[PDB]
Amino acid sequence: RNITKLGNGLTYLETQMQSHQYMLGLYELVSYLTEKHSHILFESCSGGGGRNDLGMMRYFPQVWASDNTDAIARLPIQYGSSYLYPTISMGAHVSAVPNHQMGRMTPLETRGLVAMMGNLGYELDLTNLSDEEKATIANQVNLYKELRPVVQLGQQYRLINPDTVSNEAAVQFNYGNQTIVTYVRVLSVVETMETTLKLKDLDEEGLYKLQENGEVYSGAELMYAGLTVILSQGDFLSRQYIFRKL
Amino acid sequence: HMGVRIENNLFYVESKNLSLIIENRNGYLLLKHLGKTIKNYKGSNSVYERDHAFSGNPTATNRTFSLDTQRQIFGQHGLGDFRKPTIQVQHSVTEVTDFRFVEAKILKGQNGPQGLPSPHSMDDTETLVLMLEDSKAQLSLTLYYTTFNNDATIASYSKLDNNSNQEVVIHKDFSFMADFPAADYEIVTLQGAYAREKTVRRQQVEQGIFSISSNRGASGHAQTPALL
Amino acid sequence: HMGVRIENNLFYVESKNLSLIIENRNGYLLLKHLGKTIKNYKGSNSVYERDHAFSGNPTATNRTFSLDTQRQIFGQHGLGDFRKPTIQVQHSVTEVTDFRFVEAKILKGQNGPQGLPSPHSMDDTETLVLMLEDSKAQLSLTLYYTTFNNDATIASYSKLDNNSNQEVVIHKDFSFMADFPAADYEIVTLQGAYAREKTVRRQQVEQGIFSISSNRGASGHAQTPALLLCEQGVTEDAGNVFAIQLMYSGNFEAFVQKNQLNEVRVAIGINPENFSWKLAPEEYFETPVALVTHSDQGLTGISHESQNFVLKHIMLSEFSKKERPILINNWEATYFDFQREKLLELADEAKKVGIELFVLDDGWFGNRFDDNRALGDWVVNEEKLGGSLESLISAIHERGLQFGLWLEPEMISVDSDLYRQHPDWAIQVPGYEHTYSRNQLVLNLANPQVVEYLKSVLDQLLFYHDIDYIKWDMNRNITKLGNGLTYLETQMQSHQYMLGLYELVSYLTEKHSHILFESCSGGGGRNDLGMMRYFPQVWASDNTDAIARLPIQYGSSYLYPTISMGAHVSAVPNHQMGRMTPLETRGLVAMMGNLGYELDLTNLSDEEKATIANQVNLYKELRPVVQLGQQYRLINPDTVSNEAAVQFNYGNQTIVTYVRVLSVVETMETTLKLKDLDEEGLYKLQENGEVYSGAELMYAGLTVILSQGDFLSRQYIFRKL
Amino acid sequence: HMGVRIENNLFYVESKNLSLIIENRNGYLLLKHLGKTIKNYKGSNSVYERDHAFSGNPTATNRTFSLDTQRQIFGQHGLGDFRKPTIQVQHSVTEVTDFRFVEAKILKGQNGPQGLPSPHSMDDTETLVLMLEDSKAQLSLTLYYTTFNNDATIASYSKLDNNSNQEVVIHKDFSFMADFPAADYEIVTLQGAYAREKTVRRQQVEQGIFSISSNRGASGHAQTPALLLCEQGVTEDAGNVFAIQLMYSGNFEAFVQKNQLNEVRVAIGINPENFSWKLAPEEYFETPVALVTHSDQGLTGISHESQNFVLKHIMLSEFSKKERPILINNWEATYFDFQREKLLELADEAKKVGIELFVLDDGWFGNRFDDNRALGDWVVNEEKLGGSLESLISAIHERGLQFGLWLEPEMISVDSDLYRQHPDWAIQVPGYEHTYSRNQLVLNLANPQVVEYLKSVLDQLLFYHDIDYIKWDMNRNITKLGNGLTYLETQMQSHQYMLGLYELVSYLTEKHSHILFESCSGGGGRNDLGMMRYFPQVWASDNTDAIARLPIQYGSSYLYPTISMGAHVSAVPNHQMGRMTPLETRGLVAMMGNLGYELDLTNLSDEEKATIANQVNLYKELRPVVQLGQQYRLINPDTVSNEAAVQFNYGNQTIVTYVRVLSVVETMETTLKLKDLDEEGLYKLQENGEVYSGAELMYAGLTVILSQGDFLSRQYIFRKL
């Protein structure tokens, strides 16, 4: 919650000071604790991202970016949450459907890919899942263990921004020999030419092998011609392209 | 070459690919340049001093020097500058101060406010220490600007000392200010709401004042302490 | 039916075509509707109460009622509302108040804050009196909302009473606030700069806070106490506009905040900056009057509403419908370098060209041979005037001219006998050098001795001389605040200054009700509705260039009637812009305002004099149409336009002035359509004798033809048959 | 006073609130005014004649008169006008004509091109007849402009006579052109794509030429024969709009050209592409009818004007004010896979839910088990229908349902007995393989034998069966033009095709005037005013997704009345979008149109059936309001909006439908204001019984509340007391 009813000073002046003194007290508290227990990973939170600033990030190396865990609603949130702050900070959880905040069904694949553009966790009752859903989750976890260095340690490139008008989002990460691209489309479209999606910051002469089809593309092709992005009919579909520089 | 340099009346705060160049002009500190690295700065982009109507002056006879029209690194109210101030201190019967530059030092390495989160890994940093005084009020205001050798960032904060024999009250004390030359600008901020955090906003700069702020006791869901 | 009605828990404030409907909800006052008249309001547009995260509650158990989410008419901080507050009062160890509604009354007729400019002609008004109390703090806050039967305007102000046994301090106290529902809005303001006054700005409302404000001690050149909240896509002719305005000439703030839910708060009042107000037990504080005005006829509609309200309820009745004299003013003509001979020769030439009033500007008093001394010494320089001011005045009267005089009462030069006798009368901080501006200082009108002296000196000046007109100037802004015996008294001195000024000018203008007073502040540095309550015209700008005047006049008459707007034909090259303009164009531009002349008529050719005599004869004809008639903007001189065109209708007369800034080539002629004519009316165009139906002029329009050249203009004059 | 008047050299074409004023200037016809009514026009807005560089002249000595600079009503190339021409006729060694006005007549009543769709109910009309001649070429060009006493619309077309003794060739011949004065304009068009029909586009007019056009042989999915030239900043409620539209269903072009002087030309007609017209001595050619419609009440105003004109003077009188039956159509329900059992079971369920009409779609004829054969073979598949079509029809009638049938007469499959008997009937080029589309070919309706065959087959079908309704589809565009015995006859075949179609459909719809014919072309591939002259409803789009339908219905009813606009509740997940939508939302969206059902009712749960029965009961109530009432767009589903809202008023009934596309969170509720109510009216809201004044509903509006979720909708139903 936020602070109301300021009047604990013995004078008006001491009350005027109490909001900043509060912050000094918090920083004394958290600096003490995080430093004394330097092996514990502390994650900051304030009904999600109610206090996601560089003051807190000095002591808490990750933050619960938002209570909104909808995969689609997360797109603009993650766009802003990683705009000035590194992806490694940005907590993101696969949650249940229908989503508790938006009242929305999203594909588990899309919940997966969106959360994996952040610092991945899970926040749903695994015991109430089918055997299939569990398998999918196990596969998502195996995938991210692979992607985790690229996402958390790598360089982020926004390719299509989920702004107030866009129907799409696309984010690229480079890390040494690894390049990944996640594409999400919000609403189904029809009789509309496929988006052309160009990658950034590659070696022009580099040879980039696309895991899904084994095809090898020069960095020049991927940056200057780009990928025809193909999706089936439907809302909230996503895909990922994984490349290894040879 | 990065770090802090003091050359005649110019101070050079040099991070990687980012310079802040300040001029001491008879106690007044002028923002000469903030941007890409410049060595041996001459003043091609200096404010042209002229008589601007209703922009007043520290002396009777020189109408062309006005704190209303000079580009600065901190703002006071009551000396002729009518732009929004960033330091305002009540003492005795007034909240007029007139902090004048007295002395500069350079520090190396670790440096920061006590009890507030500040940068770490500061071995390859230098800090410009600008010591200002209001002799009448007996107050010191010290500005710090820190370089980084591995990033295009400069860090800043200030320290206000009461050297008088009476209580004083700080009303406003911001951590950084810069006066940028007239030109077309846009601003980008991160705003939004609960369950809509950090919504990226972009708009044109218009005459008047635009602000984001929290009065909630926490920085808040609806605004981030950032302005681009 | 108009006036105030109290029905169960609803209060109806009903002006002509504008209603404010407020609900009392257990002590909390909710803004239900502000806009077009609604009777028997049910609540179709009520806020849906739900749990909003981090929006807190007055009780533990009801999460759906939050002052963070309700639309209100005043704002407090610390009770859960995190929107920008409009009342904030320190008492004991806190600045939390919780004012709860206790009781409503209705007043009829005259009503307003003491010592601050407020509406007149209030016979057909009623005022809603909302009495609020914070029982713990023992404070009363009383809100007033006044209806008008003849305008879509509501007036507002508040009174804060300290009923406790301890001192309290007001930190913020605005004069009007409204929470508008989430929607797309634009705002229009009047900003600009010296020699660029009242520049019309339009922008989209965005999340965050936008504000205009003055901390200069005067409303200022660069911002006007006005803010127009507009329906997306408003035009000159269509869409909803709400104008909020402040009858105050000191420091103000106007803001628009769009919060986390997309809701929009607007407010206007005294600026929190440079303001605190101590209240001892039983003392009270009243805010300046704010106005909220409405139109659904776009930007022309809001102009007309605002102009009409000014004319009928603000500008002095003695002058609001009185043709203003065509004057000569010597300032640009001679500056400080004049004497009796020169003056009377100027006066002779003015009379020959048919000018009506002669204004003696700066330099007639004390030692004032330049702008470096003598302010404060309102003693006639008989040597320079070649005898007494009485003898000069008689001389001017005998030449058949009214007589006018420039003053700057609020100012003191270091080099003056006043400063030598009373150095402590200047606004200053002990132990700090003066800050100078035009090498002068400001008098502390918060000092009752200063007000008493100025009352006395000026009353003596006006009683002992047959002066027909006063130009009241004010040539700098306020620095170095520190004349209080305490910090608190200093925080009060900027508003006390304004109270002292209003005591002074209300006294003088009322005592000498036959003198036309024109306000001035390096032109339009204080052109607001506070000053217009006492001064029925204003020197719109020191920039007298015909072309630079186009955007200035656009803004200067945007909310204020044309009759207020002083405009002078001046010399070429223009003194501010360095520009040659046709005399015809200088003429036509000034005649869209309140016409005068400000150049040395004695140095003109015989031809130039003839032209001037013709311009004066023309305007004597146009003067009723321009000053008394209805203004219609046809082409706006905005930042991009190459043209300006303004129409005035007055009974059987319709005139249109067209100006083009830059010469164009191989460009089709503009088609210029007139507005607000009788479709079936027959309109005879003076220049060609052709008769056109109003339908033709409004729906087909005039092909506008000009020769090659910059800054050309023309006028079309029509008579309805 | 309305009609045509000829006064000296001016011609006045006067519809209700819309005048076209033309001047004869020595044989040249000048557009003086198009817009609001002007009587006794003088010429305030006349073109100023001057020497414009490179703008040439009909005579040596007068450089100021140029057809490059005069505003005109038709355009020629080669006489000095370099703007895009609208008439261009080859004769002898040239395509220079110089048509000069010779004579004017006025007609009363019925008037129009033979063999092309034109306005009906013309008793209160007059037509200006402007006879032009090129004496050298011996050609006559006659322009017609028709007034309407009950709408702000003027209709136009031309007739070109060859009075020479040689063949001539028409290359270009548009149906309307107007030169508008230099000013800022925007244009609005209806474009889009298959499954995205009639997407509303708005843009600024820029120097150069903007065009929409079809070269497909049908007006097409991606462009509508309409162009709206709008006053800068037009809104739904305010500003001037001129809509130019074409009553033609073949190839068209609409263009806006802004030339070197900033002047603006707009025109619509037959596309020059795929068009030439040979005229032997004494032959003539008449263009399709163009319409120009005007409003000064913004985009809603133009919608109403255009809708009204369609309802009264275009759509068949037998149907324009007749409630349309709620239908079931089996297409999405079964595709090709049906037989008698399935059909009658579907019919049983349709009757139970209160559906009125049963439409048997594609697959009942010849060998049509898929979309790869049998087009051309309009022979009943008795095996599949389990007996004669007569027996099926009686079966349907006995279940209490009207009976409807799908046809595609313009098409032929290679695999068909028709193609085996007459392969030369297909549009084709000798020695080129066919171009295929949905694996079918187009019939050459330019061949009189083709038209005779289709007339005969279909007349036999309709006379021998009690068919209540026809769905007339057309599922591909025209390729491989080469059926002429000469190149010229090929150039003519696309327009001849249209003449053949209109001969066919006018004959059939008129002969069987009790059958409701619904036009179709893979949905809205030919949804134009040419087709709407004979088919009083149209299948707006194959996209039956409730959410995708929002922009489609926005465009589909923009210029055309809601009654025309077929809309069906379909199954989920939606077959086009792959999307789940609430049945409630599918219901409410379809009920903003002409309601039907297109899903397999036999596979529905008992609950789903109940919901459907309730939707049908609701719409029977709403049907008069929606189909007969006045439409008001409140929130537009444009490319960016997250919402849609449409209001209908009909006498004492007012309904509002609101849809939200994506779920939102921590966002204030939308405030939704209603339009065109009685301020003093009392409006009872069915759902809550509350009574609201019209003022409250228009000026305060409804707080719109929804649960969390995508694609939610609600409806508000009001009764004026």
Ligand SMILES: OC[C@H]1O[C@H](O)[C@H](O)[C@@H](O)[C@H]1O
């Ligand atoms: O009360 C528990 C709950 O508190 C806040 O809303 C947090 O942001 C959630 O992640 C959860 O921890």
Ligand SMILES: OC[C@H]1O[C@H](O)[C@H](O)[C@@H](O)[C@H]1O
């Ligand atoms: O000093 C005299 C001068 O003062 C100000 O600038 C006024 O606005 C001018 O009109 C003139 O009166």
Ligand SMILES: OC[C@H]1O[C@H](O)[C@H](O)[C@@H](O)[C@H]1O
């Ligand atoms: O082939 C049958 C099918 O044909 C087109 O696509 C129509 O638009 C559909 O409604 C349906 O009739």
Ligand code: NA
């Ligand atoms: Na620190």
Ligand code: NA
């Ligand atoms: Na008063």
Ligand code: NA
């Ligand atoms: Na016809």
